[PDB]
Amino acid sequence: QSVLTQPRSVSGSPGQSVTISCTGTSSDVGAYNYVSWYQQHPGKAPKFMIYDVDQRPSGVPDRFSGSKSGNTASLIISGLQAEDEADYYCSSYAGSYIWVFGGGTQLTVLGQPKAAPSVTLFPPSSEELQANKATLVCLISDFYPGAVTVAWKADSSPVKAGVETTTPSKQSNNKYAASSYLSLTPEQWKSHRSYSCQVTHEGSTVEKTVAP
Amino acid sequence: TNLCPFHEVFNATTFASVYAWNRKRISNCVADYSVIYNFFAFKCYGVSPTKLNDLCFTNVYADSFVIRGNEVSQIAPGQTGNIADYNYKLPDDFTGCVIAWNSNKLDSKPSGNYNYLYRLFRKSKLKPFERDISTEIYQAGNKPCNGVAGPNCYSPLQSYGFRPTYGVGHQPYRVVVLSFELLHAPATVCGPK
Amino acid sequence: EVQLVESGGSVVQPGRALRLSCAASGITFSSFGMYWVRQAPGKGLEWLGYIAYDGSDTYYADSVKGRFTISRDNSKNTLYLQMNSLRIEDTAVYYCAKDYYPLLSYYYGLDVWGQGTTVTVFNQIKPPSVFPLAPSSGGTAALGCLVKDYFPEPVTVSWNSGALTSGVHTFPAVLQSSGLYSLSSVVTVPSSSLGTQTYICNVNHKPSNTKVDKKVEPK
Amino acid sequence: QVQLVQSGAEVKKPGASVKVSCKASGYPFTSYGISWVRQAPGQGLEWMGWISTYNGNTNYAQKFQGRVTMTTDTSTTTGYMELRRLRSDDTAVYYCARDYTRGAWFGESLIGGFDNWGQGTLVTVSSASTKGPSVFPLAPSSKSTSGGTAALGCLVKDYFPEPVTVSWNSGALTSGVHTFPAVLQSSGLYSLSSVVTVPSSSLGTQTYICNVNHKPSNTKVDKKVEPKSC
Amino acid sequence: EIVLTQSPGTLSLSPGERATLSCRASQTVSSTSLAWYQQKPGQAPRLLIYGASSRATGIPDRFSGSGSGTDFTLTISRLEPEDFAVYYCQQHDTSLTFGGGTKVEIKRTVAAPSVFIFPPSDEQLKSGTASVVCLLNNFYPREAKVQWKVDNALQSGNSQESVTEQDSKDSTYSLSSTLTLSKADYEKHKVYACEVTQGTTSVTKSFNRGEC
Ligand SMILES: *[C@@H]1O[C@H](CO)[C@@H](O)[C@H](O)[C@H]1NC(C)=O
Ligand SMILES: [K+]
């Protein structure tokens, strides 16, 4: 049974409320009240936070609550604390003794002002073209919160194939760094007037363009 | 010439907790299942209620209990879930009727009616019409439990917390399951005849 | 409290088999149905399957049903994941977790997890190709080195054999669909010092015992 | 429709038993139990017990345990309530009612009440012997010392058991009449008064006769109340 | 024992007004097991409400009931003359007990009793007993203190009273007090006096023995 759809990232400031959605189908979330939620911190195992849509196991604060409506379950965290910055997964019974996890939601608890990314875009090196390959290197640094959507364009049409993008890593200054790469053929690289790496962050796009 | 006491189970002040569900046996009486034709929600498997007035049975069993509204769908043949696995199981080849009605006005209170319990887990799934009334705390570790939950000591039962402002799927439902048994004995429960 | 310790993860070739272990402290293990969950690097949780506390039943996600086998030895307080015909897709962290409640439970959650064991699936060791990323001239210019198509991690990158430190940014590596890694190290540099100071990156892939140097010159 | 008819009034010596009957009709008898409630004169309701018409099970109020026996007869669709060792404070009206508070088959509690009631049975527990009343005049003064409104009456004294009826001028004088409820004297005999207010001006010409009937003794007394002129 | 207390004892209201009768329980009474009855004088009780709020068949919809826990209410939204009666509540949550009753009587403008005193008939005296009768005719409200004084000596424990039901036409009460003496004692004294007190007013009506 297909993944449950959660927003990729969401954010709220300390003391505020934020709700993470979790939409499935008639044969999972819309069928059963066995909907559960997990919290996972960097490098740690997940922690069990909600079951039966809104019950809490031992030692989980009442500021965590849930709800369910049609095929969508929700997790609601009121009075946000800093400990709450983590990834959150929903979890649902799918019938026939099968469980399914949702996609995961990065919750960032704002502790510093929004920082836009700065983008450096490198063309394929001359040496690499002589070896019959081509890689566009898109470097993304100094943003907060640590979430971006990267898109590539050949001239103006969007390029889907050959993209590889890292998951943002926390820098030393607690902003985030990420990289995207475009794998290309020397011939297709040379058949366009320009390529374009487009990073989106909190609804605003920084763009960098490179030409053969 | 005695009428069957169906009204006694439908109009009881008191319903059992589902884990310790109640069974009345009904025998030697004239039945009128027009009662079951009359905000109630009925589903009959194997028979039609109007046709039930043309049948005789050796006994009729009336099982009753209270559950959550979103659990009513587990009281059906072939179902599985929290309640059907561990609390009240119908057989796949079930001939009978399930009646359930919202009981929020009677079984909820603003501070929470906690007087109905249900079973959380079990050593195996319930067989059809099996009733497990064990309440002994399950001991998981080496340390004994002594009737009270704690580390490695699990209460197998939990209270519903019924409040009248909850949504329908979380407010209480009363349910009666009529079985119709026929065996190598004379048939005492006939219809209006 | 009960502790779970996964073991057995390793770097393995695709198509080989691998059996993971998960060992529970104390005696509580016999009462609980256990689960396996995996998490590919930077990806979400994937529910894999379950075995009941007494072995009465075993369930499996469709993505691994028929290829993975879950079993348990209540005598040894240990749960097992038998992985067959390993794929690139199987690279991940592998978690064992205990049901919230003992006996037949199932409808609630997984409340105690282990720390995980890592499984990485690729054919052979590959050293990287290093390519120079040339600057194009605020008076600031960025130049760098592409470390392409290697397995396994890690590579370390220095600049000018240690002398250049300030301005360098060595990005985390991407994991490609193939299983290979690539990364880049960039260094921000005064624009006026191009062509007078020579810029060399030192790429070191200890898993293949290969050091590579690459001079970066303006193009 | 539903109807329960009870046996007639009973007078019993202290120490004796009484057995009140309760005939049901217009509903299926064995589906409803029967419940019993008594009411001493001028008092509230007191529950006595319950009985299943289906199997004879009974549930009695603690107070009457050992003295009460309740029975049902399915063919005459009738319920009986026997109370033994009667004392004076058992004087009450006894009611039966169709029960929907506990089920007949299973004896468990139901969402309902005592829905149809019988007309009641008076049970007088006394040592007194049947006696007609003495009737005495409450005479008006032919000297009017209270506006132009004179009160006159009959004192209907020392009779047993209840009831008496009082009329005035054979039922033709009705307006202004107050026949008081009887009181139980400490002799054990009932006593009451019946008064009427009339124009003072009418004493000279109107004739006022109270008619006191007491069927238990077959005694009717007609008393002409005259103005006392002294 | 679940004790049921109804209040007030007497409720004095007008036709068309709203009646609110209380029934309180010394412990929790489940709403399934609470009932109200009406009893007019000279008739058997009639069932009105069962299960706290359910109306018995035939009962006018102007009757309704509510409550839970330990507090239950019967509401007559508009009082018809038929509704002036006694009302009992009843529980069978644990054993079965009744309330003490609440009387709902017709409130009217206050009316002073017209007071008469009756010497014993000479006819009665010859038999050896003396009944002195004091009549309080057509008064409201019902509460009224009647005292007997003989040669100015206040009597106790040798009188008895009887009250009519509230009149069908003028909504009043009448009351009698009968004083019983032996012929010997009646003849030993001179001044016979009936003293009727309600509120701030006492009215004594007297006669002198033998006096015309
Ligand atoms: C409950 O009792 C009422 C009478 O008070 C009756 O009309 C009704 O049929 C009963 N309920 C059922 C389900 O029979
Ligand atoms: K005074």
Author numbering:
A (entry chain L), E (entry chain N): 1 to 212
B (entry chain R): 333 to 370, 374 to 528
C (entry chain H): 1 to 137, 142 to 223
D (entry chain M): 1 to 230
Text lifted from the article:
Here, we describe a highly potent SARS-CoV-2 RBM-targeting mAb, designated VIR-7229, which has unprecedented activity across the entire family of sarbecoviruses. VIR-7229 recognizes an epitope in the RBD antigenic site Ia,28 which overlaps with the ACE2-binding site (i.e. the RBM), burying an average of 950 Å2 at the interface between the epitope and the paratope. VIR-7229 interacts with the RBD via polar interactions and shape complementarity mediated by all six CDR loops, with the heavy chain CDR3 (H3) dominating the paratope. VIR-7229 tolerates extraordinary epitope variability, partly attributed to its high binding affinity, receptor molecular mimicry, and interactions with RBM backbone atoms.
Moreover, we determined crystal structures of the VIR-7229 Fab fragment bound to XBB.1.5 and to EG.5 (XBB.1.5 + F456L) RBDs at 2.4 and 1.95 Å resolution, respectively, as well as of the parent S2V29 Fab bound to BQ.1.1 RBD at 1.67 Å resolution. The epitope comprises amino acid residues 403, 405, 409, 415–417, 420–421, 453–460, 473–477, 487, 489, 493 and 505. Thirteen out of these 25 residues participate in binding to human ACE2, explaining the competition observed for receptor engagement. VIR-7229 CDR H3 forms extensive contacts with the RBD, burying ~470 Å2 of its surface at the interface with SARS-CoV-2 RBD residues 415–417, 420–421, 454–460, 473, 489 and 493. Five out of 16 hydrogen bonds between VIR-7229 and the RBD involve RBD backbone rather than amino acid side chains (RBD residues N417, L455, R457, K458), which may contribute to the resilience of VIR-7229 to epitope diversification. Examples include hydrogen bonds formed by the RBD-L455 backbone carbonyl oxygen with H3-Y108 side chain hydroxyl and by the RBD-R457 backbone amide and carbonyl oxygen with H3-L104 backbone carbonyl oxygen and amide. Furthermore, comparison of the VIR-7229-bound XBB.1.5 and EG.5 structures shows that the VIR-7229 binding mode enables H3 to accommodate equally effectively F456 or L456 in these variant backgrounds, the latter mutation mediating immune evasion of many mAbs targeting antigenic site Ia. RBD structures (total simulation time 4.0 μs for each) indicated that residue 456 is one of the RBD positions (along with 415) with which VIR-7229 makes the largest number of persistent contacts for both F456 (XBB.1.5) and L456 (EG.5). The importance of residue 456 for viral fitness was confirmed by a >4 μs MD simulation of the XBB.1.5 RBD:ACE2 complex, revealing that residue 456 is one of the RBM positions with which ACE2 makes multiple persistent contacts. In contrast, we did not observe any VIR-7229 escape for Wuhan-Hu-1 and XBB.1.5 S backgrounds after ten and seven rounds of serial passaging, respectively.
